[PDB]
Amino acid sequence: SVYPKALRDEYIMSKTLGSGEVKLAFERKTCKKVAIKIISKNVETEIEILKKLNHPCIIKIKNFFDAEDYYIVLELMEGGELFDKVVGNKRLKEATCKLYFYQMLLAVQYLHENGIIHRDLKPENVLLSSQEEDCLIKITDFGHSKILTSLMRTLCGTPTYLAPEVLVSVGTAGYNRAVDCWSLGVILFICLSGYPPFSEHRTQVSLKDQITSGKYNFIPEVWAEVSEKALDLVKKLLVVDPKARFTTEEALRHPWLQDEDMKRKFQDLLSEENESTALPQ
Amino acid sequence: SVYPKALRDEYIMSKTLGSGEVKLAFERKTCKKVAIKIISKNVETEIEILKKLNHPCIIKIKNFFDAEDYYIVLELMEGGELFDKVVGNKRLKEATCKLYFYQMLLAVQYLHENGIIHRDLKPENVLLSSQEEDCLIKITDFGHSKILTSLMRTLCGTPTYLAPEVLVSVGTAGYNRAVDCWSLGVILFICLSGYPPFSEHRTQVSLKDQITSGKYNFIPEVWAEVSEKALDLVKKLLVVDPKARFTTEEALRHPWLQDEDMKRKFQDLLSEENESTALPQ
Ligand SMILES: C/C(=N\NC(=N)N)c1ccc(NC(=O)c2c[nH]c3ccccc23)cc1
Ligand SMILES: C/C(=N\NC(=N)N)c1ccc(NC(=O)c2c[nH]c3ccccc23)cc1
């Protein structure tokens, strides 16, 4: 098939960047590069979520076409997926993991403050701004995300007719956001060590049993070169009890992220990317 | 304020039947009585749910007006709420409880087969067709109801990044419908005995603690006149484990409901209410 006419009106389509499919395109009016995500036939509400979110580590949408397929136009992240930096046991310098992880926490903290849970945080969904190692990252793919009440309404009446499982669930409600902090923990683990913590490689313990017990695969030799603070943070994110698990605020206050050099590097990358109008004093 | 013009066009409004508010009205075209529920400002989707459901023990919607307030036009249930038959420790003959309860089970079975959970089953929400003791009942008020998938999508990938609480919840998912069977249990308890099983009258045990332990208030003297089969069914519905609790199918197969006299009386009331066109053989 062809591209829809309304898209072609505004953009010149070019090469595939990844595969769902992401394409390079050029905005006709500006002659600037953009990325165009094609989702074949809540994409509707992924759009609404992304329209309303405004954070430098969250992907922004420039345009949207609902045709034979869906076309989502985004700013181009030249660096590609974080995934490609961690396959084949490739490993990032610890300093680079911190820079990237700080940005992911800031992103996910912003989501949670704004009532959004992502639910599919993984290396595939973290984009890099450039091929340089020090860069901005942006979180993408809000197709599984959830907007954070039915329990609350039930509890305003007397529970004369209310089932016991509803009352038992009051203990744990309101912690759905913690699934994102677990995923972040897993991502940090992979970045620091170049391998996944839960996996069916070697071992007879099922993947499910590894995850629900929280018994991650620790290989000392791979970790010897990783600092203790780093691994400590990983341990506080991979807590099995969602109520005890570190939140993004607690992670941002952890010793490993009290690194004014890394923060400076982040601030420097931010202002480098920004094109502001004049300011009064 | 006044009634909206589009309503007045079709109906002549009359007296209050109950209080939210329910009014007697007359359809101009037929000169027949109807009931009009006024909900002041998912009423939208309560309408869609009710439009698509077709069961003789579920209230049918005749019309709907979305104005200053919402107006829902329904068939008139002259008998009023089941609530009024059980306040002040009034008690229904056991035979009448069975007739009514059979109808409630049939209704709720129909909902569950069609992917609908009611979530607010109570005497207030069961309507009687007439002031006669043997009558049809209809379940109403689908304002808290839910249409029965996010878990299922999560489980089609590998759970490398998936939080342990999601995997633990696979054990219990798909049993939300059981909240309706608990409520039915509580309603049957009230109907048979004229008092509620969980209540803050006398006792120092909190309502919550009574419900989650399943320790209903049993007063032998009130129950002596109730059959053992009846109480047995109540016990199988007020099971605290939602997976072990009786479903509507299991309740319909219980000895207490194997009563061909009651069933005949129900069939007789059905055909009495129906106005069918001629039939070929
Ligand atoms: C919103 C979204 N998905 N939503 C959904 N699936 N429901 C989405 C997914 C991937 C990209 N990828 C990219 O920009 C790139 C991925 N690999 C790349 C390599 C080079 C440049 C850009 C990308 C951008 C947006
Ligand atoms: C659909 C609904 N509510 N939905 C919602 N609240 N979201 C509804 C609630 C109550 C009635 N009541 C009745 O028909 C009567 C209640 N008491 C009566 C006494 C005499 C005759 C009729 C009724 C009918 C419909």
UniProtKB/Swiss-Prot annotation, chains A, B:
Residues reported in the UniProt entry to bind ATP: 18-22, 37, 75-81, 124-125, 141
Modified-residue entries (Phosphothreonine), positions: 154, 158
Regulation: Activation is modulated by several mediators including MDC1 and TP53BP1. Induces homodimerization with exchange of the T-loop/activation segment between protomers and transphosphorylation of the protomers. The autophosphorylated kinase dimer is fully active.
Active site: 120
Effect on the protein upon substituting residue 247 to K: In prostate cancer; somatic mutation
EC number: 2.7.11.1
BP GO annotations: cell division; cellular response to bisphenol A; cellular response to gamma radiation; cellular response to stress; cellular response to xenobiotic stimulus; DNA damage checkpoint signaling; DNA damage response; DNA damage response, signal transduction by p53 class mediator
Listed GO CC annotations: cytoplasm; Golgi apparatus; nucleoplasm; nucleus; PML body
Coiled-coil region(s): none
Consequence when changing residue 144 to Y: Confers a moderate risk of breast cancer; partially reduces kinase activity
Oligomeric form and interacting partners: Homodimer. Homodimerization is part of the activation process but the dimer may dissociate following activation. Interacts with PML. Interacts with TP53. Interacts with RB1; phosphorylates RB1. Interacts with BRCA1. Interacts with CDC25A; phosphorylates CDC25A and mediates its degradation in response to ionizing radiation. Interacts with CUL1; mediates CHEK2 ubiquitination and regulation.
Function: Serine/threonine-protein kinase which is required for checkpoint-mediated cell cycle arrest, activation of DNA repair and apoptosis in response to the presence of DNA double-strand breaks. May also negatively regulate cell cycle progression during unperturbed cell cycles. Following activation, phosphorylates numerous effectors preferentially at the consensus sequence [L-X-R-X-X-S/T]. Regulates cell cycle checkpoint arrest through phosphorylation of CDC25A, CDC25B and CDC25C, inhibiting their activity. (Microbial infection) Phosphorylates herpes simplex virus 1/HHV-1 protein ICP0 and thus activates its SUMO-targeted ubiquitin ligase activity.
Name this polypeptide is given: Serine/threonine-protein kinase Chk2
Organism lineage: Eukaryota, Metazoa, Chordata, Craniata, Vertebrata
Residues of the full protein shown: 210 to 510 of 543
